[PDB]
Write a protein that binds this ligand. Sequence first.
Ligand code: D4E
Ligand code: D4E
Ligand code: D4E
Ligand code: D4E
Ligand code: D4E
Ligand code: D4E
Ligand code: MG
Ligand code: MG
Ligand code: MG
Ligand code: MG
Ligand code: MG
Ligand code: MG
Ligand code: MG
Ligand code: MG
Ligand code: MG
Ligand code: MG
Lengths: 181, 182, 184, 185, 179, 177, 185, 187, 185
Amino acid sequence: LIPTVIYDIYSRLLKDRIIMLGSQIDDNVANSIVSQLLFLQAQDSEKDIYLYINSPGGSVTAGFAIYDTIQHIKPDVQTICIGMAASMGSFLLAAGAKGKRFALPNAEVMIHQPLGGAQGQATEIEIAANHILKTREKLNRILSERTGQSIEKIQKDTDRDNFLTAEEAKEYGLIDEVMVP
Amino acid sequence: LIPTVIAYDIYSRLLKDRIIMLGSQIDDNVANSIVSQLLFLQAQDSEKDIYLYINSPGGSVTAGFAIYDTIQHIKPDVQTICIGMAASMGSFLLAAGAKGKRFALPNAEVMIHQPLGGAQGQATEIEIAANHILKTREKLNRILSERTGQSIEKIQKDTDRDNFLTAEEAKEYGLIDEVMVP
Amino acid sequence: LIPTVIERAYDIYSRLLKDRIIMLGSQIDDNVANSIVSQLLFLQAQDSEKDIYLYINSPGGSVTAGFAIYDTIQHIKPDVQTICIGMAASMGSFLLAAGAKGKRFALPNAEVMIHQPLGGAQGQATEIEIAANHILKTREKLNRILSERTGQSIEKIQKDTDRDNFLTAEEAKEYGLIDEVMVP
Amino acid sequence: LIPTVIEERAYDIYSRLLKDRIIMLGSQIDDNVANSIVSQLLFLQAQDSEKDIYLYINSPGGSVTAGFAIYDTIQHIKPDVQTICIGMAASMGSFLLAAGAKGKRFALPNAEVMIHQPLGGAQGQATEIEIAANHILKTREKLNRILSERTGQSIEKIQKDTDRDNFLTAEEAKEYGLIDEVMVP
Amino acid sequence: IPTVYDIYSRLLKDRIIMLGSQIDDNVANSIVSQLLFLQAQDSEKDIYLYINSPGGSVTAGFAIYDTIQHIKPDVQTICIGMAASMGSFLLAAGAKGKRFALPNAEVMIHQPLGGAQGQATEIEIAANHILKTREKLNRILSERTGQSIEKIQKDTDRDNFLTAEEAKEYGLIDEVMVP
Amino acid sequence: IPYDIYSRLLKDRIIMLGSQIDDNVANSIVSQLLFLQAQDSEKDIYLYINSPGGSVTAGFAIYDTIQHIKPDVQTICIGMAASMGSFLLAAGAKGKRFALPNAEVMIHQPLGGAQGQATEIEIAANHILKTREKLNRILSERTGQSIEKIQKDTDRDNFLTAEEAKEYGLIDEVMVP
Amino acid sequence: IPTVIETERAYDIYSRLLKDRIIMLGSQIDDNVANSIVSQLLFLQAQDSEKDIYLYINSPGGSVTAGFAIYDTIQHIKPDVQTICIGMAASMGSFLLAAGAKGKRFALPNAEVMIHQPLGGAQGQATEIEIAANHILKTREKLNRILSERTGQSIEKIQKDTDRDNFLTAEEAKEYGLIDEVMVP
Amino acid sequence: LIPTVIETGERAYDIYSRLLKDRIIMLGSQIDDNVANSIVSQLLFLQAQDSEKDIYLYINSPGGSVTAGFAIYDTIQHIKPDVQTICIGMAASMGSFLLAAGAKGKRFALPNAEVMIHQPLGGAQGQATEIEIAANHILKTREKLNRILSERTGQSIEKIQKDTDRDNFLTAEEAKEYGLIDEVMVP
Amino acid sequence: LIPTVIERAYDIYSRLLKDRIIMLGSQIDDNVANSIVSQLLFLQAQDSEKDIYLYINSPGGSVTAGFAIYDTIQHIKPDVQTICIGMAASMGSFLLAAGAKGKRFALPNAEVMIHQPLGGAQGQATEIEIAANHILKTREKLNRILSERTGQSIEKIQKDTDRDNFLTAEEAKEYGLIDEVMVPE
Ligand SMILES: CC[C@H](C)[C@H]1C(=O)N([C@H](C)c2cccc3ccccc23)C[C@@H]2N(C(=O)NCCCC(F)(F)F)CCC(=O)N12
Ligand SMILES: CC[C@H](C)[C@H]1C(=O)N([C@H](C)c2cccc3ccccc23)C[C@@H]2N(C(=O)NCCCC(F)(F)F)CCC(=O)N12
Ligand SMILES: CC[C@H](C)[C@H]1C(=O)N([C@H](C)c2cccc3ccccc23)C[C@@H]2N(C(=O)NCCCC(F)(F)F)CCC(=O)N12
Ligand SMILES: CC[C@H](C)[C@H]1C(=O)N([C@H](C)c2cccc3ccccc23)C[C@@H]2N(C(=O)NCCCC(F)(F)F)CCC(=O)N12
Ligand SMILES: CC[C@H](C)[C@H]1C(=O)N([C@H](C)c2cccc3ccccc23)C[C@@H]2N(C(=O)NCCCC(F)(F)F)CCC(=O)N12
Ligand SMILES: CC[C@H](C)[C@H]1C(=O)N([C@H](C)c2cccc3ccccc23)C[C@@H]2N(C(=O)NCCCC(F)(F)F)CCC(=O)N12
Ligand SMILES: [Mg+2]
Ligand SMILES: [Mg+2]
Ligand SMILES: [Mg+2]
Ligand SMILES: [Mg+2]
Ligand SMILES: [Mg+2]
Ligand SMILES: [Mg+2]
Ligand SMILES: [Mg+2]
Ligand SMILES: [Mg+2]
Ligand SMILES: [Mg+2]
Ligand SMILES: [Mg+2]
């Protein structure tokens, strides 16, 4: 079900510097998106890139592969939330170039604390706990820098699933504008 | 770039610019592909740098060594860049890049730990498997010592359990040379 | 399908236990060992001098469970006769050899098999090492005791248990695993 | 549905038969079944070392070593063990049928007797496969020798006749020497 | 299963055996044991074998059959519900003149079922065996019914369902018991 | 199960058919009927029926045993009698077939299956059609309804109230409190 | 599996290597893999009967008969087949490593070589088990004889050294005669 | 992982298609109806391209369906070109039957190739008369196989019957001595 | 693994279709019938007078799918030759017999099997009756057509298809299912 134009549709959008993050974030998705960002910078280091985000989130490290690549490259990466940006999806939405982070009016943004698991000996559980707590501090610190909210507020607001409308995401500082029709 | 995902594909397009993407678990298929890419790139140009991007949770030690030995065998320098995560054999390969040209992005995670395995059967079969995995660990630790400047004893202690490092800590450890700031 | 006998109602195994006969007729696991240990303890308390008879038809099983039985045999005062019927393999044959000296038997077509212990290990290199060291120590312990019980050297036992080694009743006697083959 | 009978002493039907020195081998032969039958034989000898025991056999066979537990116990005890094949005695079942006291091995007229070579398996290294092969071949020689002694047939004839599944009528089993008489009504 | 003795044990006290299931080795062993017990209790009084069974193992069925013929007491057979395959063979095996069915009971006769897998010569052995088994069954059925072996062969080629009255006409039973 | 309770009821000539009808259930109920007749050939027996039905031949084992024995067998539908269960409800002694007011009675044609060659399918079809004729004929005799009406009314699942079951002739009375 | 374009002729990476007479044995050896590698060898010799072929080996081994399909095709064709162990060559993988043209068998320094006896299975009648045992023993003799010829070690030493899993470093494989050189960086 | 090769007009072929261009057919799997249909089609194509040039049938196969095997067998005998057979790795059961079916003088094996012959395998379930029909059919199939093997090898039907009673493994050299092949190709 | 031939590029089956050869080499289901029907339609449109060749190696399958093929064969103008290679069973043998008169063949070792249709039915008595009537009518339809194609009576066809009936190529010719056995050049 992916149509061709005479390029598959996604390839055609990539030709106009549009990248589609339209799934769960895992290592494959991150590798693809990183590669696309790298390609687009090499084609033109000055023109904006557009990152569409409809994602329930996923791997934090995979998300950081994308995040760090966005910040590393020279072109501004605009982010546009369409449908849903949850968890690491909303983290990436907030990571777009300042002034160029958007959502459409009925798009949903969700923020929460990271999820994980650990099994085995007490000291193994301790290591996993310490690691996921450090990961949360890292996420919260960056979210604070990107939103203008304090680390303490971010901690409280991500304790449980916290659903935001597009307008609430703007007020929060996760995006800069809601794109009206 | 004919399709993003199935120089027709995005990875093939990057390979045209001497960029290899290690973006998965390391098994024999992945190693064979990466080895083949390294071999191809050396034949195209034996002097220009190659760039190995690493986002990997690790995997097979022997598959990892296929990649490792091919890197050291070819003439071109292979730069390594950790993005996202390099764990286990992934971090071993990160450390194996050309000296001075091993990088991580600031929020990338590096994890080191001892090798994992199994053994089943008779006592003497278990012994053989134990001796083999212990020798494999010594080989890994010795090479990691040479690549990082850390002692074998420190590497042994620090890999006893899962040990997570920030990019900056990986630099201090000697696993990479520089953190690439924006 | 375990039948009853009346003389007071007893299942057949309970009836044999009344005459100091214990039946080891399965794989050796912790349940079986606990039952057999309990039976040995009961019989010693009933009479600390009269012989006990341990029937063995077993493919072996857990080494530690086997040692629960082994140590209980050696600990109690009564002699425990061992009789191999059908098969005694692995820890089964170890228990056969552990019966009171002069009172270890097999019937003529019974099979005895000796081999090295089996096991497994999964996880980190150091975990595999610990498991390997443990199973090697367990083998040394087994071999040392088998040497003491058979009169064979530790070196011969090591060589003869490297692979599955099947013995006839008569060969088991020649080896020193039993004292006599019971002819009809 | 195993019924009870009351003599008030209550017995399941098999226990009631055991009181009259009748043992029922009515299933596949495994270690549990052998242990039970061995225990019954031992009990009956202790009750009476001179009166006959009756071993009913309706069995497709099973474990050879379990079968030998039963076989050796039969030969070891003092009482004669009569064997009666009812329904089917196959493989180790027919071996046990042939092992009853000479002159006291029977089948009912429509009972089926089947003889064949032992079955097994082996997995692993070449030398492990070799050990398993040598073992099962020795087991077959042991079975065939005893069958020769019990039937009066040569080892060579037994080898040939057990190469594949060989089904015998009760009358053919008698002619073969596996049993002594067919019990007519 | 209610108590009074469980109900089946209570019936066994009056020389009634209930074959109310598929015939396998367990069922045969139980029924054989019951027949043996009842003969020892009284070698002259009739036994009653109730049959509601879809059939099952031929060799298990023959364990029961041969035990019936071996013992001294007459074994009456009564088909209630269904007697199919080896069930109907056992119905026909009751003492002559004392084989019954209730009016709505169903009797079914058919050829034996089986399987064979492996080498050509193994398939041949299995085929020869099941054909011999069918000849043995048909011969005995002929003796018990008065029908020819050829008629039995033809009539058992496929599933053949009989009413109680048809079973009587066939010679599988002697009488239909009217209320 | 808390004599267990069912055994206690059997002592007062009450049999409980409280499940699907299969060969085990039929064998038990047949045995109970036989026992009760031998205890007393003249006193009524009471057959409680709460059953979704089941095997037709098993049902007929019960049916024929009821008609064969001397004592009257009263039937009482409590909860549900469907298919073969409603057939057995209708088989109780005339004048002594009951249901409680909220009990459900369901009648329908027999269900079955056939697989294999065309001639095997034909044999199975002929057999189940003959079985249906047998059931319908007996139901006609027990209810007073014609075979044609029974055929039409059992074509699909047909649920009846206790009162409708009485009007149909499947039972004689609805027991009011 | 990435593509490479020549300016547009498209090759996957393995096809591109095959253009330079490089065959990649990078998996378990089964019939599919053997058929592919045999076909590649046949193609390569037809293209050029004199230029060397390069067989990369990173394999845990697999089917013996599939391995022999590859082995016999290597020896049959005119071009020398160089072997290079990268990562691991175990079992039939190490047999194929040793089968490369004399003087042209290599490993990279951290590559692992493992040798052991063949593995198998057998189930069924005693005589079937015997046939399977005889077959796997003959297969082992065949493997060991060829390994002796290729390494210079005696058949007796090969038998002893393959009794259990025997892991060798690249340097030890050279000393053993399984390869001719370790390629140092 | 089936590789591509590009000829110099340029043409792209998978490796098997490239071999087919030189009249080489690869029987490299279990023999079922799909495999037989493909091989039959290849034989038919090659005969139409050239009715006189030899065809080469590579055999590495554990065997499989007898009727599928006979589809291949009969097509080999029907076409005009000689079909050479070469056993590489293993030819077992119907695989070894097809090996023996190659043109006389042009049946080969490489030295370490394994050849196995045995009686056909099957199954039957159901009524006694159904089992009988299946038994008769598989016995007739065995007679047919054995008769043809006798004609192809020069061995008697009686010897073939005895030698295929159980799994019988042959070296390439033993297969030649048996008459299943004509030559072992030595390096 | 369906190979390519270059004139554009054709898979092997497409190449044969260019020469008016259709390969029925599987179980007959709706997909297979649709493909074969489409091929027949294509070939008639290409040339309404030249023969078509239908190779048949099939265990049979769906009767209605088989009739899709059958009716399309009879509807089109070109003669459709049928050639049985390997096996034609059930609906496969029905289609073999449906080829143009005088142009139905089998190779000498090909197997032909005829039997009655198979099916199933579940549910209410009247549903079972409907399914039984339907499959019986389907059998009458098949037998009538087979009678017309073979020259055998409907009564003989009924008797001969009661159970699985295996025919040699020569027996199929004698029966009238085919016209000739193609013997080797
Ligand atoms: C055949 C037995 C011969 C009379 C003898 C013997 O060989 N064994 C051996 C040691 C034995 C032990 C355990 C299980 C056996 C099973 C079969 C044969 C001998 C067994 C035990 C046996 N003993 C008993 O049989 N005691 C009576 C037990 C009665 C009952 F419990 F009901 F079984 C101990 C004294 C003895 O002389 N023997
Ligand atoms: C019908 C039996 C004929 C009178 C005879 C006989 O043939 N057998 C054979 C050998 C036999 C043994 C075991 C199981 C049998 C089952 C069915 C038929 C004979 C069987 C044993 C049988 N015996 C008994 O039946 N003893 C009483 C047991 C009664 C109870 F235990 F309650 F079942 C021993 C004395 C004897 O004369 N016979
Ligand atoms: C009023 C005709 C009856 C019932 C008659 C009869 O027909 N049968 C037949 C043969 C029978 C046997 C087995 C199961 C039966 C089930 C239902 C009906 C008859 C059955 C058995 C029945 N018999 C008994 O009922 N004995 C009393 C003990 C019964 C119990 F309490 F259950 F133990 C034996 C002889 C007899 O006269 N009949
Ligand atoms: C690093 C390679 C060194 C320069 C050398 C070598 O060591 N090998 C070995 C034998 C080799 C073979 C097969 C796979 C290998 C993989 C990694 C390293 C060496 C390999 C073969 C290798 N050769 C090539 O690399 N040819 C060009 C292949 C181009 C393309 F196909 F695109 F990859 C042959 C001539 C040679 O000098 N070498
Ligand atoms: C140059 C000696 C060979 C190797 C010789 C040979 O032994 N075989 C045998 C019969 C053969 C057939 C099929 C597959 C084989 C695979 C491996 C070895 C021999 C094979 C056929 C082989 N032939 C070819 O190699 N033709 C060219 C192949 C081109 C391409 F398709 F590209 F692979 C036919 C002429 C011939 O002399 N031989
Ligand atoms: C045998 C066909 C007879 C000549 C005729 C016909 O009966 N049909 C019917 C309606 C038809 C339609 C769709 C599928 C059919 C499949 C089999 C037979 C008839 C079919 C349509 C069919 N038509 C075509 O066959 N057109 C050319 C075919 C194109 C291609 F297949 F690609 F080559 C349209 C006009 C016409 O004359 N007919
Ligand atoms: Mg940027
Ligand atoms: Mg380098
Ligand atoms: Mg003691
Ligand atoms: Mg005795
Ligand atoms: Mg009698
Ligand atoms: Mg009444
Ligand atoms: Mg060569
Ligand atoms: Mg070593
Ligand atoms: Mg030819
Ligand atoms: Mg036409």
